[PDB]
């Protein structure tokens, strides 16, 4: 009965590179800006969610500051939002202002940045994990023929190999920004091709792009929502050593994956 209608929950919000959503300097004036900052236990990184679709820290509401893209996300007196529909968080961690459709974004070339309301392109820098546990989740990723994804060729390529417990290059760090990182080189991300001639999924330097945003779906796929495609084993043949981005299709089993943590 009452457990079906939780009245609030206080948690943290982490995203790009595992940093936290942070009211800068714990300032409380209306329009005080929100940034990314290393995660900690400070009050200015505690966000309380309420069933009115507000998201609050230091008693005030997370909000966009403009109707068009590129302005800061701020906190402001929640009474200023009385006739506002608030925030909607998608199942894939997109945080959207319901009215403007702008999404919470860490847009700069660095992670050490002001957070802004931008047009959604499903970039990794627009992906968020709302939750108190902010760390990357270390896991193997199991796919066709019960095999494990492995980082190969000095961490530039990725394909399926027989699972070997503790084999270093078969471990992945699942970050709050929906990136899939090489566990012992967390500056490298699984990436869809940046060359339009190739559909090959590779490993590249983490850069916040659409190419690097991956969603583990309830239907068992690894989806790139920006590119409306999923990870697939080339020709449903693990011995080809190629994982590609493809449109979703239930012809074989090469689009099925799960996590074994």
């Amino acid at each position: 009965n009452e457990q079906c209608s939780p009245q609030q929950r206080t948690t943290r919000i982490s995203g790009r590179d595992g940093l936290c959503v942070d009211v800068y300097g714990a300032l409380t004036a209306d329009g005080s800006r929100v940034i990314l900052y290393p995660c900690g236990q400070q009050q200015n990184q505690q966000w309380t969610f309420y069933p009115d679709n507000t998201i609050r820290s230091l008693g005030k509401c997370l909000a966009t500051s403009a109707l068009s893209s590129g302005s800061n996300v701020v906190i402001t007196n929640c009474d200023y939002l009385r006739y506002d529909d608030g925030w909607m968080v998608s199942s894939s961690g997109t945080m959207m202002n319901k009215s403007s459709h702008l999404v919470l974004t860490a847009n700069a070339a660095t992670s050490r940045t002001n957070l802004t309301g931008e047009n959604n392109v499903f970039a990794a820098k627009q992906a968020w994990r709302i939750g108190n546990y902010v760390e990357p989740i270390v896991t193997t990723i199991i796919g066709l023929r019960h095999m494990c994804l492995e980082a190969t060729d000095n961490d530039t390529n990725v394909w399926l190999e027989s699972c070997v417990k503790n084999k270093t290059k078969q471990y992945w760090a699942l970050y709050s920004d929906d990136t899939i990182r090489v566990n012992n080189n967390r500056n490298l991300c699984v990436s869809s091709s940046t060359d339009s001639s190739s559909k090959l999924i590779v490993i590249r330097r983490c850069d916040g792009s659409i190419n690097q945003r991956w969603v583990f779906t309830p239907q068992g796929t690894i989806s790139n929502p920006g590119y409306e495609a999923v990870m697939d084993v080339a020709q449903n043949d693990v011995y080809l050593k190629k994982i590609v981005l493809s449109s979703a299709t239930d012809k074989g089993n090469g689009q099925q994956w799960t996590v074994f943590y």
């Binding site: 079906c4 939780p6 969610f49 961690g93 994990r129 546990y133 896991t139 799960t258 996590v259």
Partner: protein, 247 residues
Amino acid sequence: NLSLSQSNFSADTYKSFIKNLRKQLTIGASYGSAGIPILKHSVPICERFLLVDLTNGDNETITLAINVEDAGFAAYRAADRSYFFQNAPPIASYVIFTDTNQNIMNFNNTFESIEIVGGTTRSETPLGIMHFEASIFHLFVHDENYVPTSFLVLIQMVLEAAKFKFIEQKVIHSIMDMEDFTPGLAMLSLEENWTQLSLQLQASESLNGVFGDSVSLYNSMDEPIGVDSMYYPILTANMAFQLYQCP
């Protein structure tokens, strides 16, 4: 009936069996924001049981009745005999295994009850092929000393595996290598929290996917991970269906 036989037991056939068991259990399921199917509720007794056949190395078959509301075993049949848990739905015996000699087991279908009656816990009960086969056998002959542990084995390797891809994968690791295992904290924490995760996921619809209470799921290094929202891949790439909990 959906079935699995020891003579054709590969990682591939086991995986297909679990895939199909999920499909059958989720006929008529409801869906929320997370997109993880929610089992049916208030199902008429005549429609409440899904039957699955397990065959051992002697070509001896048991038929287990699964309650489609909670993905738990209610009863089973072996030849012209059947056995019902104490806490099976009171009317179940008029609906399933009607043309058998029916018996009541004097314990509930819960891990807690089974562990008490058998004197042994899941953490000391090995899982793997020998154990799956032996458990079908012990249930077929209803060897009272081995019935409780036989349920601990089969509930986990069939039903808990259906509930959680993580557990399915553990069993697959075990079949591929013919390497037995006891469930660790990772597996046990999923089993323990299936109902709680179901509640929180459904409850979270009103809080932008944030839970009312955090749930602790252990990883394979025995570290607890707090899941206080739907935004954890160890939940959403793992839990295959939920108990109905909220309107």
